[PDB]
Amino acid sequence: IVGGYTCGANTVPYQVSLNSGYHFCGGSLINSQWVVSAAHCYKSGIQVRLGEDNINVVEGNEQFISASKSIVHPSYNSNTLNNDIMLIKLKSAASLNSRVASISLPTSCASAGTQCLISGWGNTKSSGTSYPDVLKCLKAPILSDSSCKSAYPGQITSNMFCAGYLEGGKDSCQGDSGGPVVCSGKLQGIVSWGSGCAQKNKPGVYTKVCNYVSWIKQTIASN
Ligand SMILES: [Ca+2]
């Protein structure tokens, strides 16, 4: 996250870190057994880390649970990033508490102008590289589909939305991928892609979670 703020420990209780020896992507806890992330974060050997603030220090609220199964969206296309969503099942159920909590799925899509919270352990610099140990947060609005499409000609599908600031300086970034965009208490986006980070006229692009609620629910119901 570039241009954000330190969230505070366990203030984003649905945020997970995906670990394969190291943090590599975010995700969102949606029930005691399942995490939502980006399909481009897929890899074998995932350990889901819940209850994290400093990802390099054991602080006392963590739950580390290996993934039993990952399900990339049936129609994910890694070239275009269309349908950049996956589900990860935990080998054991998380113990839910005030610091480890699921986030609700949306019932309808969000609208441009809606304020959201974006979070992660990704790069905090737009030129250069600095990875934080503690969780970072950014409040940002959803942008109109027309402004999104104009910013990224030929690239924005109906399964994507833009959020952030056209002036630059405030965005998600590499290492935030897979993490949450939460608006009014609902998971509306997944950190997906963008041109660099925090660049003028290049807002963040996010997977449009509302399009996937039926798939998520049916997948969980049979897995
Ligand atoms: Ca920790």
CA of residue 185 to ligand 1 center, whole Å: 24
Distance 18 CA to ligand 1 centre (A): 13
Residue 75, judged by CB atoms within 10 A of its CB (0-12, 13-18, 19+), counts as exposed
- Catalytic site residue from 28, 37, 40, 119: 40
Give the CA distances from residue 202 to residues 18, 169, 192, in Å, rounded to whole numbers and listed in that order.
Answer: 26, 10, 13
Q: Which two tokens stand for residue 163?
A: 């959020």
Q: What is the Cα–Cα distance from 172 to 55, expressed in whole angstroms? A: 18
Q: Where are the domains of the chain?
A: 1-12+103-210, 13-102+211-222
Q: Is 84 a catalytic residue?
A: yes
DSSP string computed for 101-133 = ---BPPSS---TT-EEEEEESS---SSS----S
**Same-fold call for 1-12+103-210 versus 13-102+211-222:** yes
* Domain 13-102+211-222 listed as CATH 2.40.10.10: yes
E strand segments, the chain: 5-6, 15-19, 23-31, 34-37, 47-50, 63-72, 86-90, 115-120, 136-141, 160-163, 180-183, 186-193, 204-208
φ and ψ at 123, to 5 degrees? -55, 140
Which one-letter DSSP state was computed for residue 200? T
- Residues at the annotated binding site for Ca(2+)? 52, 54, 57, 62
Technique employed here was X-ray
Active site (annotated) includes residue 177: yes
Q: Taking the chain, what is the end-to-end CA distance rounded to the nearest angstrom?
A: 33
Measured in angstroms, how far is the CA atom of residue 49 from the centroid of ligand 1?
Answer: 9
Contact 183/153 with Cβ under 8 angstroms?
no
- Determine the Cα–Cα distance for residues 80 and 42; give it in Å rounded to an integer: 16
What span, in angstroms and rounded, lies between the C-alpha atoms of 177 and 118?
Answer: 11
> In units of Å, what resolution does this entry have?
0.9
Q: Which region, left, alpha or beta, applies to residue 185 given φ > 0 means left and ψ of -120 to 50 means alpha?
A: left
Domain 1-12+103-210 listed as CATH 3.40.50.740: no
